[PDB]
Amino acid sequence: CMFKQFRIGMTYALDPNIMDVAAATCMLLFRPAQSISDEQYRYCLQTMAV
Amino acid sequence: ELIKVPTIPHNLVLIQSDNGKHALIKEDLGQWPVETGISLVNQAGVFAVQLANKLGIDKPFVLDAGSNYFTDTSFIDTRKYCTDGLSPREIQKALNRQRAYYDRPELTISENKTLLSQSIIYPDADGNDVSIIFSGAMSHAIFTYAQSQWNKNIIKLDDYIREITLTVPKQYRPRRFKEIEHTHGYVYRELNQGSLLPLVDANLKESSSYYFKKLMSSISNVPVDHVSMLTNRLTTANAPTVRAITVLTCMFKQFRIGMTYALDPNIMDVAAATCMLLFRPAQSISDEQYRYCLQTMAVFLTNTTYDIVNNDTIDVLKMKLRNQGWPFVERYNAVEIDMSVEPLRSPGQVGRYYNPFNIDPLTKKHVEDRLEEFINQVQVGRFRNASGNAVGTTLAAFLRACRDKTSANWRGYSVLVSRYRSLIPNELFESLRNISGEYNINPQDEHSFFFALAQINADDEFIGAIDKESAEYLDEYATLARDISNSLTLVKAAFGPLERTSGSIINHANNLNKVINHVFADKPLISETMLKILTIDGTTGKDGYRNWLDKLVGHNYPVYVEPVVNIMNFISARFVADSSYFGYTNEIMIMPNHINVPVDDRFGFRDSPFCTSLPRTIMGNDVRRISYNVFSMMEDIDDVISEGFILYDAYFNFSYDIMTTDGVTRLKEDILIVTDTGNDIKPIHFYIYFENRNDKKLRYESKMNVSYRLYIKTPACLLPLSDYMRAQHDYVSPSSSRVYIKDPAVVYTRS
Amino acid sequence: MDVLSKGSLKELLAHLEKTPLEEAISYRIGTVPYQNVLISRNEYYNQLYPDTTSLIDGVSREGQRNVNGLIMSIISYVVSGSGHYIPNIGFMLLRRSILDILTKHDTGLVTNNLNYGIIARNLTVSKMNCEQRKRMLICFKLLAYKDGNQNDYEIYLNQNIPLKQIAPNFIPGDMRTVIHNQDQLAIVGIPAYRLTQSTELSIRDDNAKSYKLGYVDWYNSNSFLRERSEFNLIRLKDRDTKYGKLNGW
């Protein structure tokens, strides 16, 4: 929140469970969009789709 | 790990007479015995490794000599005075004594300052520190060449990351290097990949069996979560074994699997045959197995006999089954899925694997779009009887259960296949084959596998176990590649082609045993990994290596020349070229004392045995040249030796010690020994003294007491003190700001 | 902004291969060039600051509907960040990449009659900087080797000595030359000096500063690709590999 250049990312398992999807949706919903990269955004969408 | 060498090997000794008149500098690289009658290059290679060990250049290294300096007391002088090499003070003392003999003024302060400042360290533009020291020529040449070879494999960390960026998956957390590593980080890595094909092609059955068994042991540990005849035969005892076969069929290319049916087929055999054709890749089923499966279905459904359909072709069998009402007469190709990253040991290549159960990833259904229509056909079919529909209904129900099971569990098995596929390289994917049929499926186990398909559970223990296997596989492939390179070099150097003659066969067999006995003594050259591959058939590891080496003779496989091979080739070449540096020569001369031969007068020796070059003519006539073999066999040696001759065609080992006093220069032993078998030259050892030029006693002793003299070419290690500027040589040491990273891995192990 | 951030011959040429021709043209009518205008610069003066409109400013301007205008718009996009208004070119030409237009005969455009003297004069070269001139000379070299006018390119450089001194050294058909080149072609980037949020008097300088401050915002935004942090997330096709080379080179 204080520093805009700081970023947040998470790494998921090869076969995601319900916990990974919950973590991905929580990060998308509640963390600032300015702190989630485009590559991280695609990775979260890939995990949700899997 | 890189070795950081603190000091430079110079190998310089100063020898001066007691009078002080004569001084000299010598390189002491030791004495190396050379045997005549056999190849000189082969002996040079053995001595090359020992010389490299003596100089400290055998293992990868860098030079840290930029801190070996001091500073003079003068305020004007801000130079750095190197402490390596032969000390300039020693040369100053030797020059100082020489002037005392000649009644000359001592060295001046300005002349002293110039001499004592000859050894300096200064930095270049790139940040390296270059040291100028007094050192021998041969040591400088070998040391500098070794530095060039090793520095080829020292690259920036960012350059290493770019090379391996296409092999890193997306499930691993990136590693944050420190800021110093990113700017000044360097790594020593060898970036050349050796092919495993020479071992795999030579032993396909053994290589395939080794890797197939290893993979099955790992897969079998994955965690998981008329009707009467079908329902009485289900067993899950060998389900882990069938599971591993399924993953193997999809992770490899052409991993043929086979099923054997009973003499009298029943409804279970037809169910197994249908499941094999419907839910297994066509690439894993051979044409003969396809025909056998069609025959089994034809025997049961049409109520014919195996003899009738033993001569039937594939097209005829399909026609017979379709007429009866059976549409399952086709095998289906699997859909290949591309790996997300470049596979290991496959640079610039794309890996792929079949999707399990013939499920199209785009449509998420079976590749056969007529599957539901086909099942209805079976349900309303009249097989094996006039009426009743017992067989059709039973098979329709069994087929539907398999269809739902495969649709639900395809994602879980696809993940398992993908992860195990990343373990093997592309060469093993395309080369390994199932020979001898050492894995087969029982018909009851097949239909139990699909009826009772189990979901795949990927616990944290399984993921951690696989990551450990990945590290083990990487080390195993690297070890195998090195031993293949070592074997290919050994075969090329030590073996030749064969001929249809008894002598050639006998020669080859004896040489093969000599090599094998040598490479298995002490610490074996060959690693335990490939010995396991060659022993898997039951033969002794020593015998298996002998068989593999024989097959490799005459190969055209390219072998990359590594830095260590380049270093030893350099030392071997200079061993042959400059023999005087190492204590042997190919030519000696024996002359009577009354014959005056020109000699080297640079060093001030008394009756110096060293000539600049062995004279072509003496007293206006060419000097006779006799080979050692003819000389040994001579019976009139007394007449020949009276005129003097030159002996060649042999490698003469000689030694000498320079004595600071004055005396009669002579040999330790007599020149020759005469026996009833032959004549030989005794070991050569020179006692060399400096000369006073005015001693009547020593002049008389040298002329009259000694009657014959032995002359050799002047050793190149010797160098007069006046030419001390010829020992001035440069050495480059990389900057001290660099940091060397032991573990250059770019990701961590966590989901 | 993306085109102006390329700092090497490799990155600039790679970007031109990926981008299509529609990025080079603009669909805003703009104004006409070579017109003396009075603009408002209130941070410095109360009166109106005189200046002259050109094709090198970052604002879209009306352009001629010919091959000469199309090439001027492409070079303007490379050296300024915005192109001109040439509509109804055709979807066949607009789909192709900027590099393909410059160095491929398959597109169908005929550029042999183009003269580098007037193009440099119209795309005002006395007002460019060193980085802008280098990019223009790259485009001239690519065009010259497309139509086999290498000799004419050399003679033009020999006439203008300063252009020869800064002319990039690369053969348009060879990829080894692109790798070895070490020219700096970046017009925007992270500044070592102190960059403030202030206006500049000239039209060219004000627009260039807007791109520079815009790149800083984009550099620190979420659209930038930090290789040291997320190198394993890029696809394998667009990952940086030394074996990678331009198509047909």
Side-chain angles (χ1 to χ4, degrees), chain B residues 160-194:
Chain B
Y160 177 68
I161 292 172
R162 262 191 336 120
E163 281 258 327
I164 68 140
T165 185
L166 299 170
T167 77
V168 189
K170 67 152 70 77
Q171 324 108 51
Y172 298 101
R173 305 176 310 144
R175 164 161 176 208
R176 308 280 194 258
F177 287 97
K178 257 79 185 163
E179 301 297 280
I180 296 167
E181 274 131 357
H182 267 301
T183 299
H184 302 109
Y186 280 75
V187 295
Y188 177 82
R189 316 273 298 177
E190 168 71 71
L191 293 182
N192 169 255
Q193 318 216 117

Side-chain angles (χ1 to χ4, degrees), chain A residues 10-16 20 42-43 46 50, chain B residues 170-174 411 415 418-419 458 750-751:
Chain A
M10 329 178 318
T11 295
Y12 315 95
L14 200 62
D15 184 1
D20 291 355
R42 205 174 56 99
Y43 191 23
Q46 276 178 348
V50 155
Chain B
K170 67 152 70 77
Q171 324 108 51
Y172 298 101
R173 305 176 310 144
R411 181 186 64 83
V415 175
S418 95
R419 179 57 182 111
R750 182 57 57 85
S751 306

Side-chain angles (χ1 to χ4, degrees), chain B residues 294-322:
Chain B
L294 287 163
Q295 284 171 15
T296 310
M297 302 177 311
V299 161
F300 185 71
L301 300 179
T302 306
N303 219 31
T304 183
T305 52
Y306 263 115
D307 326 303
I308 289 168
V309 290
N310 192 31
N311 64 34
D312 259 6
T313 59
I314 279 170
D315 290 349
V316 173
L317 274 160
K318 280 146 75 106
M319 183 176 282
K320 285 163 130 200
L321 274 149
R322 273 168 173 151

